[PDB]
Write a protein that binds this ligand. Structure first.
Ligand SMILES: N[C@@H](CCC(=O)O)C(=O)O
Lengths: 145, 223, 48, 97, 339, 48
């Protein structure tokens, strides 16, 4: 139901929070080795609060990462609760369309060349459609083919 | 069960491992069943006690406990007089009726009458003004409201031209625009999230009861 | 003391058989719906 | 239900899915594959067959079932005939002698 | 004047029927009488003007869940911190350390406790954590059930309270293309021409021919809006194959009129003929002929529209709130760096 | 590692429940994240 650009925006927010956790506290410019420390730890925190993981070692002491983690966890609850709501809305489709009427369908009284209502030729249905007088305008259309 | 924790250890024995697995599964079953019953409680559109459409079957069935009263001595009596189809009900609906409009509109809302037979002209105004009634979608037995003058009055053509020009410029759109106020409540199940704060407060009072109970618990602890 | 009525009255053959009438300005029908009641709980302490 | 006779003997003996023997009768019927209408001896069985057996055992009489071909419209002489009189064809659909 | 009405002037047609809406021209060149059915000018598509559906995430809150959650955080934090966290007479920085960790612990328990942080020692604090977790899973169940139940409800493009909007005056208002027109040589061209000169001057460049061509244009995507008669739109939209497009509202149209007849000179029946129409309502023929000839196919209480997800917005609005909290955290960082 | 691994995965399926502990390898943390994604997807499809 949603385009890939939505998930690309979700990941973009993961990059914004990831670079934000590095922009807050002071560190040192990397770009020398392959694996970092505060970047990998901040990514583990983003995937820990977003995807709801579990691994005990500490807690964010700064209030900036506390509020950012609170609004980020709230955003995670919003996207998972909205995704679950879209799943229930997808399962509650029930398809209440393309149904019938009941004792008499309106399309039976109106002629239609693209939706022919054929029947058994030379049977009791021809006698029932012959002895009637109500639906007599359709016997000529349903009589052929 | 309640999904909490602390972070200090883990059950080493396999008995508490399997018991904790089936216990967590039972917790997921009871919370998923509680959420499912909550959604089933909010999805209860009550798709019952509704109407039919252009003609209700109860109107043709004579009943003594659900009288379908109407405005006595009005146009509805003439409409029920010039017809020939529903002639077996004019004798039943002819008796026990009110000759006033305010008595009927006040009676159907002040717990007196069961139902009323009247056009939607006043029903849409009283419903869109008092915010107590609601109109349907279909409009069976359509009628027109015109102006009648004398046969020897030559001004009927000029007044008719004033009505035509009054409906061609857009003055009727201004009258209906300034005399028909769109208030809410379009259906019986359109905005289920219009309360919420009371449903959450009904549990909040129990949370406060748990706070006082916690004060009693710490009172036991300090003792 | 009557010359012209501005009230939205109905048009029938019994009334129009002895007088001339004009075209209506609004065509509306009759309804039978009264009101609707939605069952719900205000307090809601579940366990119901 | 019309089923052709297997091999060159009588009907195929079988059972149902609940534990009850099924009875089949002899019925002569044509064939839709061959353009002609030959007398094809087959075996009939179904609801009307079991009802005919019930009525055949509740009353002391002998019967003989036969399959009817086409002509199930009461004979509606609508074709422009060469100036001739018509009569009751199929209709009530009984006395084909 | 020319056309079929001229047949009334040439004394070759004493009476004629068809799509003849009562107005001033027909009542000016010839006579008139009472119409038997009502109609008017309407738009084929619904009254929406191409608007995006609002966000459905902040609607259940209504500026109440956040405020009440903040108050409950204040009273639960205060009452919870002045029972067992304050056991020895300390200074001001004492209870603050338990408040800063307490609000993050409660926030961790509300959002499925995405971080276990730690745990105290008192058993009553553990019981209160259990109760707060019960309120967290109950609030989560009511939040998912309330959000899902609200999503199942009608959240499609709702009708607006504005008939004559920006498209009836200035054509250069919406950047994407929006074509609209009608069939030339008719009552709608003269009515709109005499009521909106800009809509006519901008409408003559988009003309139709028939009804099947307009249906093919609206089905393929060539035409956007189609303004025509109310009856032709009820039969056209009624006899639809997929039942996708719907008229404005459910029957509320402007300029009420009706199909009537025209006579040459008032000398025959005339009035009694009108009584004949008054006889129809006396026999119930309007219901049988209405449900027999005026009926459609897509007649099934058209009041709710549901499909897939369009939010290419709601989550964008929540992301905008995340940007607002980001700027608030930036200003808070500036205030922290100033000290 | 199997006895603790099955209890860790069981803890991740039934919504945390018990954080138990965590290893050291980053790829194991990524696999824990993917297993948690399948856990919340299976939970959403289970409740829905
Ligand atoms: N009755 C109109 C056509 C329908 C419409 O008004 O769009 C005419 O004769 O020109």
């Amino acid at each position: 139901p949603f385009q890939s650009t939505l998930w690309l925006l979700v990941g973009l927010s993961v990059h914004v929070v990831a670079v934000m956790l590095y922009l807050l506290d002071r560190f040192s410019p990397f770009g020398r080795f392959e694996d970092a420390l505060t970047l990998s730890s901040a990514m583990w925190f983003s995937w820990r609060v977003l995807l709801n993981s579990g691994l005990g070692e500490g807690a964010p002491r700064s209030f900036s990462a506390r509020i950012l983690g609170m609004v980020w966890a709230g955003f995670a609850m919003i996207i998972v609760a909205s995704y679950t709501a879209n799943l229930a809305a997808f399962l509650v489709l029930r398809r209440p369309e393309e149904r019938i009427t009941g004792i008499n369908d309106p399309r039976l009284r109106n002629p239609s060349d693209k939706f022919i209502y054929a029947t058994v030729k030379q049977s009791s249905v021809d006698i029932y459609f012959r002895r009637q007088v109500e639906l007599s305008t359709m016997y000529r259309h349903m009589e052929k083919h | 069960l309640l999904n909490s924790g602390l972070g200090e250890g883990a059950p080493r024995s396999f008995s508490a491992r399997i018991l904790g697995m089936v216990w967590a599964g039972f917790a997921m079953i009871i919370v998923a069943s509680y959420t499912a019953n909550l959604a089933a409680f909010l999805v209860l559109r009550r798709p019952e006690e509704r109407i039919t459409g252009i003609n209700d079957p109860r109107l043709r069935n004579p009943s003594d406990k659900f009288i379908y009263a109407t405005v006595k001595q009005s146009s509805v009596d003439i409409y029920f007089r010039r017809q020939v189809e529903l002639s077996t009900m004019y004798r039943h609906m002819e008796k026990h009726n009110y000759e006033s409009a305010a008595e009927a509109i006040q009676a159907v809302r002040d717990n007196k009458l069961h139902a009323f037979i009247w056009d939607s002209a006043v029903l849409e105004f009283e419903a869109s003004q008092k915010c107590d009634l609601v109109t349907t979608g279909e409009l069976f037995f359509r009628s027109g409201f015109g102006i009648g003058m004398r046969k020897d009055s030559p001004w009927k053509q000029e007044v008719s031209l004033n009505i035509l020009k009054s409906h061609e410029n857009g003055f009727m759109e201004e009258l209906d625009k300034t005399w028909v106020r769109y208030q809410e409540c379009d259906s019986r199940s359109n905005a289920p999230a219009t309360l919420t704060f009371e449903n959450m407060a009904g549990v909040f009072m129990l949370v406060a009861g748990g706070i006082v109970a916690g004060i009693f618990l710490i009172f036991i602890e300090i003792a | 003391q009557a010359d012209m009525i501005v009230a939205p009255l109905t048009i029938n053959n019994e009334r129009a058989q002895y007088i001339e009438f004009s075209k209506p300005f609004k065509y509306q029908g009759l309804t039978i719906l009264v009101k609707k009641e939605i069952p719900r709980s205000t307090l809601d302490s579940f366990m119901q | 239900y019309v089923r052709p006779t297997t091999s060159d003997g009588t009907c195929r003996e079988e059972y149902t899915i609940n534990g009850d023997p099924i009875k089949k009768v002899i019925c002569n019927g044509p064939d839709e594959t061959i353009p002609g209408r030959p007398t094809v001896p087959q075996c009939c069985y179904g609801f009307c067959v079991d009802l005919l057996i019930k009525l055949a055992r509740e009353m002391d009489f002998t019967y003989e079932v036969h399959l009817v071909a086409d002509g199930k419209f009461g004979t509606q002489e609508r074709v422009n005939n060469s100036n001739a009189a018509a009569w009751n064809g199929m209709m009530g659909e009984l006395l084909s002698g | 004047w020319n056309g079929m009405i001229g047949e009334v002037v040439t004394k070759r047609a004493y009476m004629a029927v068809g799509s003849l809406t009562i107005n001033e021209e027909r009542s000016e060149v010839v006579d008139f009488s009472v119409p038997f059915i009502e109609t008017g000018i309407s738009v084929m598509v619904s009254r929406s003007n191409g608007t995006v559906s609002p966000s459905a995430f902040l609607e259940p809150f209504s500026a109440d869940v956040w405020v009440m959650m903040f108050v409950m955080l204040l009273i639960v934090s205060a009452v919870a911190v002045f029972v067992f966290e304050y056991f020895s007479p300390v200074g001001y920085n004492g209870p603050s350390f338990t408040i800063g960790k307490a609000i993050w612990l409660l926030w961790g328990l509300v959002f499925n406790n995405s971080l276990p942080v730690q745990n105290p020692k008192g058993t009553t604090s553990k019981i209160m954590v259990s109760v707060w977790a019960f309120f967290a899973v109950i609030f989560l169940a009511s939040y998912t059930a309330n959000l899902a139940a609200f999503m199942i409800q009608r959240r499609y493009v709702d009708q607006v309270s504005g008939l004559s909007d920006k498209k009836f005056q200035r054509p250069n208002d919406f950047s994407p293309a929006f074509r609209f027109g009608t069939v030339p040589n008719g009552s709608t061209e003269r009515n709109i021409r005499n009521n909106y000169l800009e809509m006519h001057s901008y409408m003559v460049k988009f003309n139709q021919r028939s009804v099947q061509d307009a249906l093919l244009s609206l089905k393929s995507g060539k035409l956007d809006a189609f303004i025509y008669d109310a009856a032709v739109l009820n039969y056209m939209a009624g006899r639809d194959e997929g039942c996708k497009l719907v008229t404005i509202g459910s029957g509320k149209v402007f300029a009420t009129t009706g199909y009537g007849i025209a006579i040459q000179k008032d000398s025959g029946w005339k009035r009694q003929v009108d009584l004949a129409i008054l006889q129809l309502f006396g026999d119930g023929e309007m219901e049988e002929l209405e449900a027999l000839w005026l009926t459609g196919i897509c007649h099934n209480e058209k009041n709710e529209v549901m499909s897939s997800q369009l939010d290419i917005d709601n989550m964008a609005g929540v992301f905008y709130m995340l940007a607002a909290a980001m700027a608030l955290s930036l200003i808070t960082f500036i205030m922290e760096h100033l000290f």
